[PDB]
Design an enzyme around this catalytic site. Structure first.
Site, mmCIF file in Angstrom:
data_model
loop_
_atom_site.group_PDB
_atom_site.id
_atom_site.type_symbol
_atom_site.label_atom_id
_atom_site.label_comp_id
_atom_site.label_asym_id
_atom_site.label_seq_id
_atom_site.Cartn_x
_atom_site.Cartn_y
_atom_site.Cartn_z
ATOM 1 N N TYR A 196 0.786 -1.241 0.000
ATOM 2 C CA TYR A 196 0.000 0.000 0.000
ATOM 3 C C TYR A 196 0.816 1.288 0.000
ATOM 4 C CZ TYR A 196 -4.735 -1.683 -0.163
ATOM 5 O OH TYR A 196 -5.931 -2.212 -0.601
ATOM 6 N N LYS A 212 -0.064 -16.026 3.444
ATOM 7 C CA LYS A 212 0.309 -17.007 2.409
ATOM 8 C C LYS A 212 1.809 -17.372 2.537
ATOM 9 C CE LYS A 212 -0.884 -19.356 -1.454
ATOM 10 N NZ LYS A 212 -2.046 -20.248 -1.758
ATOM 11 N N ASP A 261 -6.268 -18.117 0.520
ATOM 12 C CA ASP A 261 -7.159 -18.790 -0.404
ATOM 13 C C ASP A 261 -8.175 -19.688 0.329
ATOM 14 O OD1 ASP A 261 -4.874 -20.397 0.174
ATOM 15 O OD2 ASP A 261 -4.932 -21.375 -1.781
ATOM 16 N N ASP A 303 -8.240 -6.228 2.710
ATOM 17 C CA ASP A 303 -9.065 -5.549 1.748
ATOM 18 C C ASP A 303 -10.047 -6.520 1.106
ATOM 19 O OD1 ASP A 303 -9.879 -3.309 0.072
ATOM 20 O OD2 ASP A 303 -8.726 -4.219 -1.561
ATOM 21 N N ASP A 328 -14.360 -7.270 2.200
ATOM 22 C CA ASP A 328 -15.431 -7.131 1.221
ATOM 23 C C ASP A 328 -16.271 -8.416 1.154
ATOM 24 O OD1 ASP A 328 -14.658 -4.411 0.415
ATOM 25 O OD2 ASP A 328 -15.356 -4.875 -1.609
HETATM 26 C C1 IPM Z 1 -0.176 -24.881 -2.617
HETATM 27 C C2 IPM Z 1 0.047 -23.458 -3.175
HETATM 28 C C3 IPM Z 1 1.537 -23.227 -3.502
HETATM 29 C C4 IPM Z 1 -0.786 -23.255 -4.461
HETATM 30 C C5 IPM Z 1 -0.710 -21.792 -4.895
HETATM 31 O O1 IPM Z 1 -0.524 -20.932 -4.000
HETATM 32 O O2 IPM Z 1 -0.845 -21.559 -6.112
HETATM 33 C C6 IPM Z 1 -2.252 -23.584 -4.242
HETATM 34 O O3 IPM Z 1 -2.818 -22.667 -3.260
HETATM 35 C C7 IPM Z 1 -2.966 -23.455 -5.610
HETATM 36 O O4 IPM Z 1 -3.895 -22.618 -5.666
HETATM 37 O O5 IPM Z 1 -2.533 -24.131 -6.573
HETATM 38 C C1 IPM Z 2 -10.611 2.677 -2.222
HETATM 39 C C2 IPM Z 2 -9.394 1.802 -1.849
HETATM 40 C C3 IPM Z 2 -8.094 2.633 -1.879
HETATM 41 C C4 IPM Z 2 -9.580 1.212 -0.432
HETATM 42 C C5 IPM Z 2 -8.470 0.200 -0.150
HETATM 43 O O1 IPM Z 2 -7.969 -0.399 -1.133
HETATM 44 O O2 IPM Z 2 -8.146 0.039 1.042
HETATM 45 C C6 IPM Z 2 -10.902 0.480 -0.295
HETATM 46 O O3 IPM Z 2 -10.927 -0.662 -1.201
HETATM 47 C C7 IPM Z 2 -11.032 0.030 1.181
HETATM 48 O O4 IPM Z 2 -11.143 -1.203 1.370
HETATM 49 O O5 IPM Z 2 -10.950 0.902 2.079
HETATM 50 MG MG MG Z 3 -4.709 -21.852 -3.833
HETATM 51 MG MG MG Z 4 -11.632 -2.465 -0.296
#
Ligand code: IPM
Ligand code: IPM
Ligand code: MG
Ligand code: MG
Ligand code: IPM
Ligand code: IPM
Ligand code: MG
Ligand code: MG
Lengths: 335, 335, 336, 336
Positions: free
Chosen positions: B122, B168, B199, B223, B227
């Site tokens: 950021y 991660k 993930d 972020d 959401d």
């Molecule tokens: C296990 C990990 C390294 C892998 C990634 O981060 O891509 C998995 O999360 C995926 O989505 O294939």
């Molecule tokens: C508008 C954007 C800069 C902001 C962020 O990315 O933090 C928004 O997505 C939030 O979550 O406050």
């Molecule tokens: Mg993954």
């Molecule tokens: Mg946001």
């Protein structure tokens, strides 16, 4: 014919891959498929034996093979699958999140995430700068952004001709800005095109997953959105993957090692088997031989029937059967 | 007393903030609150007048103020809210995702995301290295990781004493590794503690949001997860935020400018009003004056009644009323 | 007491180190120095025999040691020296450039000390290929490191002519070099005669008037370059010692290379190694507090200067016709 | 035809540039050169009057120009010169270090050319504060840039003694400096007498035997430092020109500073500026293909050498008692 490096992996990888092997062999015989599977060593246990999670001996076999088919790897996964994506430039990670019949939580779902698979933060350019201070280099390139956007165009042409490019260029003006610009340059005017910030994509997936056809995005964002989209479709246990580059390809489930259910005969083999389906599709398109297409249809029809009938489903997809029961059900419907 | 810099913002910001002003003034009078709101200039339109989205004149006022209360800003948001988080070191971004009565899609939901708000990607350390090649520096520090983990401990003590640290570190061994280690060192043994990859967090939020109490994570991950969690709770239109540092604080909705519904009198004011609720809570804890607590309870009880009754809700929360109708309903229940 | 890992190294390294042992022993005998020298392997020959330039057992002994005393290493010099610098935070690199009596030299008598920050800048090897044909490296400048090196420059300058120049390029590197310069300012101004010079101007000014400089304090890369320049100007590059000072550990080595060309001919000049033993003894005084290491260093340095002053037992590189062995005996006789 | 933005700059810049105009005009007259000189403002005085070291109108004229010809700039030199280098990809910095006849000089006659990569390394200003007391900078080395600069080194060496040394520190910077060295290798080996030298060894070896060097090719920072060193060794720093060559644009300037000390006294030496006009005319031959720029450059350079050879009309810095104006007339008389 094809030579396939088959990596079993860790946790539920061995049991899912080894049990699924009966279906791979049945397809080979029923459809006279000239595919040789060679088992290769990779992962956490492999690291204990060799000192490397992906040793030279395995690399020697993979270099010879045409394709890689794998179960999940555990804690060393970055030294296995990330190392392979990088070294063979398997730049397109294709993850279809598709509902199967007789599942929800969201009804009809069919979303393809096209995830850039070679750059972003995935090349491990990380360092301790100073006491308690660390840094990583995120890399975005036009070349890599253009080629992934091309893959997303090709895929979307085969679906609803709609693509959303997902990024965070409001905050990451230069890196994500270059990504979006490259995507815009390939896609806009060839398909219905739009752009969405990754945070709003995460919310919109939940609010209305049927509003999405193809999603094209960067490595880490795609990692996250593909897991969310996969669960929305119904289970990470049904989510397959193709990692496609120019010379080689790699097929695997989206899900992880699942160590807490390893050895308990309840892992869903569907993600792996659907990854085999994507492997066979590609074998068709490379060979021009319809037999691989026939084997792919037999496989998918079989899985779809099992889900539609709904007696032999694992717990993760709302059933109460074992991995064995599921495999036998699918096997008997082939083919 | 308090001086509050009030930033209206862009898109639906002006209409939501200016209409909500009637409730802020009614609370000031009913509970004898010594709060002065000073309107300050920031955002897309402000950039057209000054050449800066956050001009010196505004900074002069903010420097004098105790707190910042704001609507969403449009395309220049990074030059406004990110600049403010950085310059005042508003390091804890607190985002409660809480269901209100008489909404779903997931029933009872109550999750707090504690998002590190000053580092990660950021700070805009991004460059074009070479033709078609761009780079960004991700920064993770022990200092910043430790302090956010401390905030997550304090919050979780007031809830169910359960925290999941999301990162991660399987792929980002050094940066995310340092983050997790710092979180582990503050949290483990003081609350029920665990760790989850980002993930799998995204999927698990969908699969079982009631399994989550407090989530502590990095800037970009927070972020995204906030959401998703916000939508799961029912609408980004109900999701408030507190950005808290040592000397100053900033209160605002999680949602964006929503330009496509701006000017149409259907924006949900609830996220903003709930952010005012968090502002008043903090005024209580800084002043030791119960009046701010009484005003906060009146406000929240009022909103909760309006939702429970369910006649004056905006379209985003399943109703058919206007922003005006919602504001009058809440106003008459105060106080 | 102290334990010293004694590394013989490559090329002339082994002959110089091993023929100097009799001076090590003399010093221990005459000044009752509780120093134990343990032989440790490192360098090209070590790599060929053991597979590593710094094998496990070598690192084991180095850990236990208080100080490292080495000869030159060949092709593996970076692998050895840099790793040791970063591993043990040997943050101050002290590079004296001083004429000896009375050597032929183009610029007359020069006496300059480069104090070189020895742990950050570009030496951490934070480098990568980010794209086909594009590489990147991360230069790191910290306040802590820059402050530490300036404090070292303070003490060395006070011991000399009270004059320090901070060398940098902050007109172009506004943030990294600007933080270095600011940290040097905050330590040095009001305690020494302080000034700043751009690194390119420094390189020209060393040539133009080397007699104007006393102490130079600068960053890792700039120091590598200016040390060698200043060293050649003084005529002392083959003769001069160096110190890498850390809090728990220090390393002492000649600045000269392995000189494979002359290995085995009994002519290599042991002066650089011997003066680095002089810098080791200085650092032993500081850590232990006891005066005997000081008396020993002065005895050593007096002995060295006197053999250069009399001219009868010098090796051929400094204008004599003696062997390393003959030079060492003469030096050894003047001690105690 | 060509358009040249003529920047007078600061300190002695304005007197040298404006008194040299009569030589510019002579050259245009005698050799029928279609060159238009447009005066452009830049530097400290410009910043004080207009608010920018390079105001809008200056950038407007620079865009239209083919070449920039400047005097020295003061405190805003980095703001001016660096921006121009990056903006117009002026990738080759040509720094000759050559003795003139017959100047007093410590090392005799030296003739060395530094070819310095002028657009990457640490000069892109990719720097930040990442944390309290911690700063970082990004060094960039590309194959394209390193290849381009080596090709330039090839052409300059072939015109000289067919000898190039690539200077780097790839023992420590294995990836960035390793790519630079590899790119220089691939261009140069088999076409010139090629060798490599570590940057610290180069700084020492320039002092030790400057007569051994012909062309040095190196990176941005190493070149800044070695140019000045080589320049001082040759005794030519106040006298020597420089060129920054790009494909669509080039910049020519003396290497000497603004010398505010002597501004207004009618004594500043115009030689460096005038030789940089010589390098401008060389580059005009290449882009246009026509021989008249060559005849003009040789006329200019002949005239300069002859006034130094006769000794009667030189400024005081090079051992004479004349004014800038008197030196210019003598030079001007020998042209055409
Ligand atoms: C296990 C990990 C390294 C892998 C990634 O981060 O891509 C998995 O999360 C995926 O989505 O294939
Ligand atoms: C508008 C954007 C800069 C902001 C962020 O990315 O933090 C928004 O997505 C939030 O979550 O406050
Ligand atoms: Mg993954
Ligand atoms: Mg946001
Ligand atoms: C051999 C090399 C790594 C080392 C350095 O660069 O410092 C050497 O040049 C030195 O000066 O000690
Ligand atoms: C003034 C400075 C930015 C410039 C440089 O560093 O190149 C100067 O030293 C030079 O050599 O041209
Ligand atoms: Mg060196
Ligand atoms: Mg310079």
């Amino acid at each position: 014919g094809f030579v396939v490096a088959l990596i079993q992996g860790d946790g539920i990888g061995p049991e899912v891959v080894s049990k699924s092997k009966t279906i791979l062999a049945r397809l080979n015989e029923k459809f006279s498929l000239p595919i040789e599977y060679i088992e290769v060593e990779a992962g956490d246990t492999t690291k204990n034996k060799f000192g490397d999670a992906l040793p030279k001996d395995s690399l020697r076999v993979i270099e010879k093979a045409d394709m890689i088919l794998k179960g999940p790897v555990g804690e060393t996964a970055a030294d296995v699958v990330v190392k392979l994506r990088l070294m063979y430039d398997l730049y397109a990670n294709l993850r279809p999140a598709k509902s199967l019949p007789g599942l929800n939580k969201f009804g009809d779902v069919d979303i393809l995430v096209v995830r850039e698979n070679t750059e972003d933060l995935y090349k491990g350019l990380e360092h301790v700068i100073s006491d308690g201070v660390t840094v990583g280099i995120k890399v975005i390139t036009r070349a890599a952004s253009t080629r992934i956007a091309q893959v997303a165009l090709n895929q979307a042409l085969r679906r609803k001709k709609k693509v959303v490019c997902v990024h965070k260029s409001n905050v990451m003006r230069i890196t994500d800005g270059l990504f979006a610009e490259s995507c815009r340059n390939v896609l806009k005017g060839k398909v219905e095109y739009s752009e969405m910030y990754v945070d709003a994509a995460a919310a919109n997936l939940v609010r209305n997953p049927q509003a999405f056809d193809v999603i094209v995005t960067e490595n880490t964002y795609g990692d996250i959105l593909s897991d969310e989209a996969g669960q929305i479709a119904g289970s990470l246990g049904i989510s397959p993957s193709a990692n496609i580059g120019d010379r080689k390809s790699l097929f695997e489930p989206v899900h992880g090692a699942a160590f807490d259910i390893a050895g308990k005969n309840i892992a869903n083999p569907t993600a792996f088997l659907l990854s085999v389906g994507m492997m066979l599709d590609r074998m068709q398109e490379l060979s021009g031989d319809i037999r691989y297409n026939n084997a792919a249809k037999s496989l998918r029809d079989a899985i779809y029937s099992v889900y539609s009938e709904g007696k032999y489903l694992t717990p993760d997809v709302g059933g109460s059967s074992t991995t064995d029961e599921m495999i036998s059900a699918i096997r008997s419907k082939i083919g």
